[PDB]
RNA sequence: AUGGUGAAAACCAUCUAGUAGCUGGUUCCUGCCGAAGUUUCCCUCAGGAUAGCAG
RNA sequence: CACGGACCAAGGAGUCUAACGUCUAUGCGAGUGUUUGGGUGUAAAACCCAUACGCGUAAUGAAAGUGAACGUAGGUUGGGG
RNA sequence: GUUCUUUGUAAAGUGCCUUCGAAGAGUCGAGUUGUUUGGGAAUGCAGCUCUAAGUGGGUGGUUCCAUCUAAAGCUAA
RNA sequence: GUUUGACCUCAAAUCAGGUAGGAGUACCCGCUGAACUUAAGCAUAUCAAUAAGCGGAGGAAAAGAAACCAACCGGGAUUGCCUUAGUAACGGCGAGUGAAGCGGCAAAAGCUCAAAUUUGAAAUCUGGUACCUUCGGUGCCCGAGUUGUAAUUUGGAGAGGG
């Protein structure tokens, strides 16, 4: 070849890279459970197999709990703003619990919400709240 | 004329590709859930084989959402349909079964 | 490049031949014959405990 | 086809108010005044040869009878 | 809006408001240069379904082509040339001579920065969308190319000269079938 | 033929290892067997279709 | 007749592949073929294999069909043994 | 893993009930002159002439039935 | 108002910020296109939807989420491999040319516009400039933009409310 010819020749130097092993033994990234229980001497499916997880969920061509216990283990483990709150202290004050009234009022209820929208509100404000 | 020498070479380049879609998809199963599907033509009725996606039908029986099913990896196809009444229990069949097998981690 | 480089085989014939490679290891003169010094040792075919 | 094409009466308002704003085109100019004197029998022959198939210069006849009786009378 | 009836409007093409609109204009862009540079679409129901947002960067140059390969290419190849750091997006046939037509070709800058940001649309900031009309990637490159789905185009599906090396060259396996 | 360079009809590079109803040449030993020189139509002229002789 | 040979060293010409057969050997046998692939591996080797497919296993016809025991799957004559 | 901040009558999702509900034209197609193919139902494309429809339109199967939704675009392996 | 002022259009500048050319070219995408050679002379078949030439890209490209294939107890983006198969089919049926659906596998991922009003408030963006924790954020000014920029929707529907 021409341009390698020169490469050779030159004195600059190649920009030699050295990544053939890395391209096998690849560490797994995405969990910790399995970045402990992993044997990099086994392969793919073999370490899936040890485990107790599935590897493929088809009928694979071809031929052919420690660690599952530890996930179940890890799945065992909102407010409203201020004038939300300003304003439903402001309605509930002036009826009480006439949400007919609450809605049908103009002045206090500015946003036409229906019945279920106001009363629900209240319900969450009743529990941070009287 | 080409010539396959890279047979060889070219298994331990998507064996190595399995491999590292194992170590970055790390507790999934590298593939999704695919259906159990009817071939078509008279020759090849007899065979039942995996098809591409569920269904909307499918998916909405066994008890789950369309945009929430591709997020737990079942693969869903729109254009399907289920005119067969014995190939849509048996997909409901490995839905319900594949949900009881299922663990979704939190997101916190 | 595209001469004949591997061979296909019966998978039956290969199977055969591995067969009779490994009975011919337990013959002991089939062995000597071969090469391998094996006048000092204490049977064949030769079978060493599992701790090895 | 569900979705096969429902009559829209919004569509078939916009349709039939540029029918008229737009005018009429030249062969169809010829084609109205065909159907008044030669009738509607030459009038399918000259439409057909204009159009591409006779499905087309059917509703096509058809849809200047409709302009014609409407435009007369109210 | 009145997208609707824009859309049935240029329908009747050879009606009297539209025949008059032809005439004017057909003189009007005579006047004018080969390849020149309209500030709007005059026809902007069609340049919108074919993707054109009337904002910074998207760019509306209308094109002269003789008459008697295809035109819509050729208008779309002429203003590549001359609009080299534009990208070809789509092109629409707007009026026509008895001696030439006219194509309002429209343009987007890759260069300019309210195409870099949105996702819509900062696709095109590619390098793989260079000269879309030099490969026939355009509407009217991809309907010329006889790329579509059927029994009809079994020949010429995914590339006519792929098709051809893929049927008359000899392939070999290690083991012989 | 394609593409190019030169010039008071040319050359260079590829297609092209172009195509031969042919010319010249074809690389170790020994043993054993061993011809034919032609039948009949495809018409023959060319190439063969067959029988004969040697296995 | 003629064509080749001044001499010497080295180089130098029935090869490789595909398609289709011939015979012989090997494997198995109404079946047979792992090697497109997947699994595995001391890593282009070797070792395993799913579903299919290839060819063969049951014929007689031209559009439409039918289907092989009167049977020690025959009676005789021969016929290696 | 470790924290610092999360707000706004904010952003969605799901089931039921009620009222509506627009989808690309000098394009589809038609005749013809060339190109494309081994293409028999000019396949595909281009040139030129004319040029549609909305309980629509394209493609196939023996009188219906099945199948998609062109004439806009993006996208890894 | 015989002034003046809105726009639209055409200009301008050694202004500010950019960008396009050329090289490489095995692969890919377009465009253009011979002849020696094969069937007997050569118009097709045939060299050949080749070579040369021209234009354009990238780490791949192209293709791609159906206006698809089918005729079945239906499949379901695209690409590639195995097979279908030297089959259908075409070819002075001859040199011969030569698919495709299904099936097995490799790899798998879907979505964005245009479409009917934000109309109780262009909710959007460019640029300049001042700072900041600078592949950017914020304030302020300017321009674009209603000949429609944002949010909401793309038939798998969807939206309005309850």
């Known amino acids: ?130 | ?108 | 490049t595209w001469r004949k480089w591997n061979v296909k085989v019966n998978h039956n014939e290969k199977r055969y031949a591995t067969a009779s490679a490994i009975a011919a290891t337990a013959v002991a003169s089939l062995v000597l014959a071969r090469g391998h010094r094996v006048e000092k040792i204490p049977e064949i075919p030769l079978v060493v405990s599992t701790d090895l | 086809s569900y979705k096969k094409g429902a009559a829209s009466n919004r569509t078939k308002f916009v349709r039939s108010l540029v029918r008229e704003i737009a005018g009429l085109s030249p062969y169809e100019r010829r084609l109205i005044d065909l159907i008044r004197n030669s009738g509607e029998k030459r009038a399918r022959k000259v439409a057909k040869k204009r159009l591409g198939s006779f499905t087309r210069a059917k509703a096509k006849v058809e849809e200047m009878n409709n302009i014609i009786a409407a435009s007369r009378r109210h | ?177």
């Open chain 2, 1 to 108: 004329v080409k010539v396959h020498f890279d047979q060889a070479g070219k298994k331990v380049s998507r064996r190595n590709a399995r491999a590292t879609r194992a170590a970055k998809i790390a507790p999934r199963p590298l593939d999704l859930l695919r259906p159990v599907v009817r071939a078509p033509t008279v020759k090849y009725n007899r065979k039942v084989r995996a098809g591409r996606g569920f269904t909307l039908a499918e998916v909405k029986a066994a008890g789950l959402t369309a945009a929430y099913a591709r997020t737990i990896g079942i693969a869903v196809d729109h254009r399907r349909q289920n005119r067969n009444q014995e190939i849509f229990d048996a997909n409901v069949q490995r839905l319900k079964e594949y949900q009881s097998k299922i663990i979704v981690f939190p997101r916190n």
């Open chain 5, 1 to 177: 809006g009145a997208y609707k009836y824009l859309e049935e409007l240029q329908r009747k093409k050879q009606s009297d408001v539209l025949r008059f609109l032809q005439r004017v204009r057909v003189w009007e862009y005579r006047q004018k240069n080969v390849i020149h540079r309209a500030a709007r679409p005059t026809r902007p129901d069609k340049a919108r379904r074919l993707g054109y947002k009337a904002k910074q960067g998207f760019v509306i140059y209308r094109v002269r082509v003789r008459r008697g390969r295809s035109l819509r290419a050729t208008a779309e190849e002429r203003v590549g040339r001359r609009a080299a750091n534009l990208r070809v997006l789509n092109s629409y046939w707007v009026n026509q001579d008895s001696t030439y037509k006219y194509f309002e070709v429209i343009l987007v800058d890759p260069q300019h920065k309210a195409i870099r940001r949105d996702a819509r649309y900062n696709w095109i900031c590619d390098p793989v969308h260079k000269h879309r009309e030099a490969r026939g990637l355009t509407a009217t490159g991809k309907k010329s190319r006889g790329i579509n789905k059927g029994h009809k185009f079994n020949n010429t599906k995914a590339g006519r000269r792929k098709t051809w090396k893929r049927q008359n060259t000899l392939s070999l396996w290690r083991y012989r079938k």
């Open chain 1, 1 to 130: 070849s021409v341009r390698k010819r020169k490469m050779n020749r030159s004195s600059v130097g190649k920009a030699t890279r050295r990544n053939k092993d890395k391209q096998r033994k690849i560490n797994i990234q995405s969990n910790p459970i399995i970045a402990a229980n992993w044997d990099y001497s086994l392969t793919m499916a073999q370490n899936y197999k040890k485990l107790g997880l599935r590897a493929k969920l088809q009928t694979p061509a071809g031929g052919k709990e420690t660690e599952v216990v530890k996930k179940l283990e890890e799945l065992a483990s909102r407010s409203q703003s201020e004038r939300e709150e300003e304003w439903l202290e402001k309605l509930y004050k002036k009826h009480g619990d006439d949400y007919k009234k609450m809605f049908f009022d103009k002045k206090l209820n500015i946003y036409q919400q229906s019945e279920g929208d106001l009363k629900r509100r209240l319900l969450r404000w009743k529990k941070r709240n009287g």
